[PDB]
Amino acid sequence: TKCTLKSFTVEKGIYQTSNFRVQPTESIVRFPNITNLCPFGEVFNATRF
Amino acid sequence: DSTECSNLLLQYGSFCTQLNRALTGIAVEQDKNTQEVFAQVKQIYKTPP
Ligand SMILES: *[C@@H]1O[C@H](CO)[C@@H](O)[C@H](O)[C@H]1NC(C)=O
Ligand SMILES: *[C@@H]1O[C@H](CO)[C@@H](O)[C@H](O)[C@H]1NC(C)=O
């Protein structure tokens, strides 16, 4: 509150300050687990263009 | 939920806090309007039976 009001004194009242959030508890990853390596050798190192 | 955006929003200074102040002035004024309109009576009178 003191930081939000930029003041060391604060009067009788109700003050918005920060906003509470439940923290992201773990970092989930969800991807198509397809096994093939992409054909980039046939993109860049092919015989002719 | 972005710290990166919330850093760039500090460059704009007190815009964000004065908007919350303005909306809080409005929001308290809605209670003030309601108090001024309805709370003109200092006792909760109740009817006879
Ligand atoms: C992806 O993983 C699940 C188990 O987590 C498995 O059942 C599924 O067959 C896998 N898909 C591929 C494309 O390998
Ligand atoms: C293309 O060939 C070179 C060797 O000539 C190799 O180092 C490189 O990794 C290859 N690139 C791809 C995308 O396969």
Swiss-Prot record, chain A:
Where in the sequence does glycosylation occur per the annotation?
T25, S27, N33, N45
The source's superkingdom equals: Viruses
For region Disordered, the annotated ranges are: 21-37
Consequence recorded when altering N33Q: Reduced viral infectivity
Q: What is the effect of changing G41H?
A: In strain: Omicron/BA.2.75, Omicron/XBB.1.5, Omicron/EG.5.1
User: How does this protein assemble?
Assistant: Binds to host ACE2. RBD also interacts with the N-linked glycan on 'Asn-90' of ACE2. Cleavage of S generates a polybasic C-terminal sequence on S1 that binds to host Neuropilin-1 (NRP1) and Neuropilin-2 (NRP2) receptors. Interacts with host integrin alpha-5/beta-1 (ITGA5:ITGB1) and with ACE2 in complex with integrin alpha-5/beta-1 (ITGA5:ITGB1). May interact via cytoplasmic c-terminus with M protein. May interact (via N-terminus) with host bilirubin and biliverdin, thereby preventing antibody binding to the SARS-CoV-2 spike NTD via an allosteric mechanism.
Describe the task this protein carries out: Attaches the virion to the cell membrane by interacting with host receptor, initiating the infection. The major receptor is host ACE2. When S2/S2' has been cleaved, binding to the receptor triggers direct fusion at the cell membrane. When S2/S2' has not been cleaved, binding to the receptor results in internalization of the virus by endocytosis using host TFRC and GRM2 and leading to fusion of the virion membrane with the host endosomal membrane. Alternatively, may use NRP1/NRP2 and integrin as entry receptors.
Q: What is this protein called?
A: Spike protein S1
Q: According to the entry, what is the taxonomic lineage of the organism?
A: Viruses, Riboviria, Orthornavirae, Pisuviricota, Pisoniviricetes
Complete-protein stretch covered: 299 to 347 of 1273
Swiss-Prot record, chain B:
Q: Which domain of life is it from?
A: Viruses
Q: Which residues of the full protein are shown?
A: 745 to 793 of 1273
| Organism this protein belongs to | Severe acute respiratory syndrome coronavirus 2 (2019-nCoV)
User: What is this protein called in UniProt?
Assistant: Spike protein S2
> Which gene holds the coding sequence for this protein?
S
Q: What is its biological role? A: Precursor of the fusion protein processed in the biosynthesis of the S protein and the formation of virus particle. Mediates fusion of the virion and cellular membranes by functioning as a class I viral fusion protein. Contains two viral fusion peptides that are unmasked after cleavage. The S2/S2' cleavage occurs during virus entry at the cell membrane by host TMPRSS2 or during endocytosis by host CSTL.
